[PDB]
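Internal QA ticket QA-208
Title: Verify multi-chain structure generation after dependency bump
Assignee: T.L.

Test input:
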Amino acid sequence: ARYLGPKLKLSRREGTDLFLKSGVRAIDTKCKIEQAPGQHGARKPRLSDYGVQLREKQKVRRIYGVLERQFRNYYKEAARLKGNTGENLLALLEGRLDNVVYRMGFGATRAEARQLVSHKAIMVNGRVVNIASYQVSPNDVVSIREKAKKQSRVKAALELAEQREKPTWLEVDAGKMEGTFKRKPERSDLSADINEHLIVELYSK
Amino acid sequence: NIKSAKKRAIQSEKARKHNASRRSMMRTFIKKVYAAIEAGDKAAAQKAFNEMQPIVDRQAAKGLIHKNKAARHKANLTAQINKLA
Amino acid sequence: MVTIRLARHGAKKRPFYQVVVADSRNARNGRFIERVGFFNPIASEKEEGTRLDLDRIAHWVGQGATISDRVAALIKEVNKAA
Amino acid sequence: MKIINIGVLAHVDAGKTTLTESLLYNSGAITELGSVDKGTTRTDNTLLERQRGITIQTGITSFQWENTKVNIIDTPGHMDFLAEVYRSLSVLDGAILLISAKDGVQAQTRILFHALRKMGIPTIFFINKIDQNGIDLSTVYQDIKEKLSAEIVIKQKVELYPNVCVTNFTESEQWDTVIEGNDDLLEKYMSGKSLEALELEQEESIRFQNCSLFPLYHGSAKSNIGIDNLIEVITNKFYSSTHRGPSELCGNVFKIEYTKKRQRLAYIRLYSGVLHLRDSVRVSEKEKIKVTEMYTSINGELCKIDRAYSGEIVILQNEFLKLNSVLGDTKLLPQRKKIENPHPLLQTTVEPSKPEQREMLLDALLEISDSDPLLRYYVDSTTHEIILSFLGKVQMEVISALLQEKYHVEIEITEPTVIYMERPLKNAEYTIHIEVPPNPFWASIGLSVSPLPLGSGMQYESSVSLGYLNQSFQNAVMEGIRYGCEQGLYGWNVTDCKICFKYGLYYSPVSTPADFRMLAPIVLEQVLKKAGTELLEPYLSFKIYAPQEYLSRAYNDAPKYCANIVDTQLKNNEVILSGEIPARCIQEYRSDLTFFTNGRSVCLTELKGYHVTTGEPVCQPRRPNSRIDKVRYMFNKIT
RNA sequence: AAUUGAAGAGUUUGAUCAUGGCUCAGAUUGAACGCUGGCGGCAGGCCUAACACAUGCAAGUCGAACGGUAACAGGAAGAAGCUUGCUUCUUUGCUGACGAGUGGCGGACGGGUGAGUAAUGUCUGGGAAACUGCCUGAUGGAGGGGGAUAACUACUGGAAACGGUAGCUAAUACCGCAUAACGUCGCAAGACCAAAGAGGGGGACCUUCGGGCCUCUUGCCAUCGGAUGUGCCCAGAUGGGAUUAGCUAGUAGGUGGGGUAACGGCUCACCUAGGCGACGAUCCCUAGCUGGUCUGAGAGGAUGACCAGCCACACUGGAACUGAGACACGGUCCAGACUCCUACGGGAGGCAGCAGUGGGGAAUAUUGCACAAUGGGCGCAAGCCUGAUGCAGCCAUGCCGCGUGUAUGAAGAAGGCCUUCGGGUUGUAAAGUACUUUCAGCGGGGAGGAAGGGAGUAAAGUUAAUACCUUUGCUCAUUGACGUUACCCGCAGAAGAAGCACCGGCUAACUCCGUGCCAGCAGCCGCGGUAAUACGGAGGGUGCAAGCGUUAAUCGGAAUUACUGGG
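Actual output:
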């Protein structure tokens, strides 16, 4: 399932910053970003249309930690929905519990959030949940159980989130780790950098 | 095959015995009638029909005859014995 | 003999009966005249528990359809005064 | 609870299996034929056995006496494929040799007896065929003592006449040396005074557990005298079965057989615990294997059983069952193993009859592999000729009759491949030429093969200077020379070669490693054409051990064999000599020692020394070679 | 709100442009094979031999139909010990009950398989000349007699299987007779047609003390209904082959007789000579059909495994019998092939029921637990029966979820690989440091599937009756195969858990060394004859992930069968 490999090499491959080692400290410069994918990282790729499409899709997947299969499922789920596929895919990827928890600041990186959720520290609507793929319905209330509340890591990990942009589609108690998911996030809120168009393309063929 | 419910076999034979016998006597009275018809003795014909009617209704009531076959015998047989009478 | 009976369907370990009028010789999940409501044993207390279209049932009662024990119990549970 | 296993070492055609049949009769009935002369039931089982006048393999038969189980097997003492009988030693703790009245125990019996001494398990002597002329009433037993090399003493005495004495003895005063070996019996003997026979019987049981000496026996089964009470001795004297049921269950397969209606049956003993019917069980393959069916092989008829008792032996069907496979895991036992002391007892060819039936016949050979563990074969020949590891004269008759029975194929061969190796006669210059005078490829070289000392093998050197040799070019010439070593002009394999490459002209634009590599073989065949060749044959040493009295006569075998005389030495009554004869005639040497020794002969050998030379006419075995490009050019070179 | 939907690429040439095949990118699978493999959830699991099958089980039930009583448990006349009522113990259907037996019902359902079938089937829609056990509505009847036989005893045949003669007996079995109508026939007159009773409780009355009588319950017979189920009929549609053009004599129609529940050449007698066919009859090959499944923008194309309806078959061929319903999977008879038994005289068998075996095959599971739940059979009910069903075992076979740790961590180490030897890269990766415990391991708690049914009690109905009975509340005792359940809590420690394919172009991702048109690779085009980006290894990278590849198969792309949509 999980990637659990060099969570910073991927960031180099995508050339940007997947925030995989977003970590406690801020900006890295501890990996030689951009111009170092690997042994032949100095190469400038000819980069075929397919190339940019695939590259895009992977970037996005590596952001949210979703694998190929589950992803394609999300896609089919986006096509079967109303509105427009582009906004959909990212709204559903945004709906994942590990993602929302991450946004709340409950954990440093996203994988940290995942490891938190999986071990029953997270409790939404009083109903404790393990699955990260759990889609958080609008007007829910995610929190942290008392037996796992303010247990070292979560504290500093939440001190980190103060420098982040912080979503307007969700809120946090900060006083007792009692967050509150609200509306479905608008497209012009998240991303504005990762391109949904190319992803829609890739599965269109 | 070995099966305790094989009583259906011996009983069904013990039944085809009796039932077959009755079916026989019935159809033989009917024959008696048909012969009466062929002879042209409308009187003896009517007689034989009177002699057989109760024994066909009686066997039709016992499920031996479907009381369609009984009405059928009574139908056309009468059409004959009275067409000549 | 027409009879009203639960049809046991749904998932494994998660039974969902569909009360239905059908010939007694018919297979349980087999052929039937018409389904008439449903029973949900593991539903507990929520938005739904057990629907049952009493009109058609009553149509089959005066039609000679023998109600099975469970379905009878349901006819009781939906009551006529509760 | 259970019952101890009993052997049947009827060495030299002792006929002890018939004694097993009569014992099967005495243990009866209550409903049995009682057997008959010859075959005859007696758990003969497979056809071609009783019809052959002797069992082709060891059998099994359930039996009971003295209120206890009494499994027994026979005979496997014939020939000849006796290794399966050695496999039988794992299948039972007990033993019961059938001593001949002819000059004591048979010399063939002595091998199985000494092997029984290797077994570490108890056994008892039996004076079979007591009802016959020339019986050793006081002579053959002495041969039993001189040959046994132990301390066995008769438990009973008899002579006849129509006499059939058994319990009347035995060994008053003089008997009790086995008790003398024990510290306790030695102590009571130190005490002096006469004592009850049971009191020495305890020490006799103690030494008997160690198998310090074989129990006495007498009387012939044919006379129906002593054939019963001796079985009682087999029942009481036999070691108790290790009953338990504590678990966990464990054991191992002893033997398996392919019944025509089987189609297969894997016999196995319960070394510990018990296996419930229709239940999963461990396997040596590390995979689950349910016991779908199993049943005891009763002598009157096979019978099913719901479960096996601990220490019990029983056949069972299975999807798979390798020989000596663990049934636990796992049983832990230590014992020596051997198979007639030979890798192969003179392998013989077995080419199948008919264009297509022989291919099925190889599958029949696989079925032979399914049977007795002591057999092997492989298509080492390029023609895929068979070469059975099976040995002995009568055993070949057994495999052949089995081929004529269960299968529908047969073959007649014995010579096998000569395994000859040609060697160069003398050094000579040669060259493929240069450019294309000529034939493709344009690459060419001046090979210069030279004579080499015998057994030196192929040899070569890169005399050519770089870069004309090429860092990755000359190696193709070497591999090509090896390709030319694959067969000589006579078709014999190359040997003692010394191919020193010299010239190597080539043109760059058209030169390829494959071209020069093709050129090499032409240089090899060319040098071979000028060498004159010389045949070479194997001459493996052949050590032999025969009795000294026949040792002079064995010298007469020397003149009859190509093998040279060699150093040898005496070993007690035994005599030994280090032979050295060619493999081509070595196969008959076993028949020669077998004939001269009167079956007392024994020998061993191993291949060595490729050098030898042979005559006459230098005959060679075709042929090489085909299925490779460039051979047509080689045919062009000849003319 | 409820199909918002259609992509192209490589390869013919020196190059182009067409034409035109081939091939790839997708989805799919009842898949197999190779490598690897931790868990859970829900499904699926002999597509080949309709091959042959050891063994167990898969259909019984009713003592509220009957004579019985072979066991068992209680009761009684009597019996023996001895603590004379404590025990021993023979009779006794007299009760609780229940083998064998008669009778009723079921066994025509449920389960399997798809051989046969090109229409005698199926689907769609109509139709009339029918029947329909059980269930149910309405209206009446339910009077009075007889003769048998199984069991059972006596004897006797047969090795068994399995009887035979002679006696005794019962019924809701069987059978006349009375009895009848809006029932059957007939134009009517008229004629004829049926049956059974059992169980619970009971005041008076009546008792030859067998009980009569009263009442509730149920079953019985007739008719007309209702519902359901089944039979039948027609039209349309439902594979390929014209290198199959003619086929047909019960054949096509008629008339009459028989026959069927019912129409009908369904079957005979005679009469007429017709009937079908180029809008493909006959013959041939293949095929169960359908709802649907897969694919596809759609039209279509392929398929019809699981689920559900229908049809066909039950070792092979044939036949009828019983019954409401079969011309019958675990019935009968007959023949046959094939297995086994035998005392050789004769008998037994039918796994396309569930497991299981051999054989076939690339290939597919336990000789499980239980009737607790749903349904069926029977029964008043209790219960019994149930390989249906519910679960469990098994297999990565598929879909889906999760885990295999997260954060920090430059000396930017060792080793590896590369290099212009300056360095790079593997690499925040590792070790280190700080936390975390899901999931497995271990120990405790613990839902829900259970509704009922039984015992008791009060009430309202029933009724001569505060009795029984039916119904409703109400009390106690309870009913779980799954099941060491789900789920929660606690314990320890990063602790037990990552592979597979690929890296010339198509197609995401490159180098070094080994080999030298050899060894090899290859879906296509092609590489190898030189520091091969194409072979083999290594390093690195990419893809996917408990899987990843390969192969087979269908559709798509393919407007390359074009109806939409071509020449």
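Spot checks passed. The radius of gyration of chain A is 17 Å.
Status: verified.
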